Ligand binder design. Structure first.
Ligand SMILES: N[C@@H](Cc1c[nH]c[nH+]1)C(=O)O
Length: 332
């Protein structure tokens, strides 16, 4: 019994042997397995729980994007029978060529720029592709707000308040203001019109925009991997998710936001309503919600206090950034 100190299980050899890759060496590396041939050529093998039908549309989506010029993805390798996956032991395995690069550093404008460019290219290249294949962003955030309010009410009535409880209570008025401003933006007719128009025109988002899926290459581009969460969705979702992650880790340095907006805009103009949808998402106090949710619904962990402390440290810089962006959007 090793419990949570159990290593990633090796992919069964029978799966490897369905391919024609003459693999000599295999080892886990993060959430993929690296397969290497006698020349040292590498492949990334993924153990997934996605359905085979889902794997098929995912591949078809990327091949469609490619016929439109898209290059920013790891290329799938097929089995000896031409299948895009192997199904074995209740898992779906798929393999891609290896992409040389490093996980994007979302604190560097250059890396944010290239991630944004790539995400925008993916969205553009997939316009109109299987648009009805499977969205209530207002309801999601409304529920989070209701949760957040309940959580600080719970904290306030504790006999003994710990450092986290007290810190969360100290920011209630700012958190309330931000949540209210966000939900008001989601209720604005222009934001809704944007979201609905995107739903109609299609275009997929990647929807797992984390450094380990955004590989910054020696050719100074970003190549995406892991399209398992990708689906038709408004472009603002990928844009806002990239921005939030970048900005929270670069203390709201607007060079990171500019790098992002410029490179989305280069592929397709950002209209005012798209900016406003992005603002609605960014204005919501997502991190305090998420951290408090974990604490009070799941269990306390000291990392939650670290995270809330960092949010508090950055809170004025975040306010300043969102203020300047709001002004920018009024004089586009
Ligand atoms: N080259 C990536 C790993 C990878 C390539 N393809 C899939 N995963 C890295 O930074 O480690």
């Amino acid at each position: 019994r090793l419990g949570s100190r159990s290593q990633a299980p090796l992919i069964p050899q029978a799966v490897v042997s369905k391919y024609d890759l003459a693999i000599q060496q295999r080892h886990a590396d993060g959430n993929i397995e690296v397969w290497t041939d006698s020349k040292g050529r590498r492949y990334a093998a993924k153990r997934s729980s996605i359905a085979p039908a889902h794997c098929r549309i995912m591949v078809q989506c990327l091949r469609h994007a490619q016929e439109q010029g898209f290059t920013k993805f790891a290329r799938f390798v097929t089995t000896s029978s031409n299948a895009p996956y192997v199904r074995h032991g209740d898992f779906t395995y798929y393999v891609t060529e290896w992409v040389s690069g490093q996980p994007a550093n979302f604190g560097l404008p250059e890396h944010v720029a290239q991630t944004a460019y790539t995400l925008a290219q993916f969205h553009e290249a997939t316009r109109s592709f299987r648009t009805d294949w499977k969205d209530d962003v207002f309801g999601l955030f409304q529920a989070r707000w209701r949760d957040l309010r309940q959580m600080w009410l719970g904290a306030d009535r504790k006999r003994e308040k710990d450092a986290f409880d007290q810190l969360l209570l100290s920011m209630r008025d700012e958190l309330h203001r931000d949540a209210a401003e966000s939900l008001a933006l989601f209720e604005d007719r222009d934001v809704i019109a944007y979201l609905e128009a995107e739903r109609s025109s299609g275009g997929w988002c990647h929807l797992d925009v984390i450094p380990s899926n955004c590989l910054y290459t020696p050719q100074h581009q970003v190549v995406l991997i892991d399209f398992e969460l990708a689906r038709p969705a408004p472009r603002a979702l990928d844009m806002a998710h990239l921005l939030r992650r970048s900005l929270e880790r670069g203390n709201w340095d607007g060079h990171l936001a500019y790098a992002c907006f410029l490179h989305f805009d280069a592929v397709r103009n950002i209209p005012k309503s798209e900016y406003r949808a992005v603002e609605a998402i960014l204005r919501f106090p997502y991190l305090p919600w998420r951290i408090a949710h974990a604490r009070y619904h799941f269990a306390a962990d000291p990392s939650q206090l670290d995270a809330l402390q960092q949010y508090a440290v950055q809170a004025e810089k975040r306010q300043a950034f969102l203020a300047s962006l709001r002004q920018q959007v009024e004089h586009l």
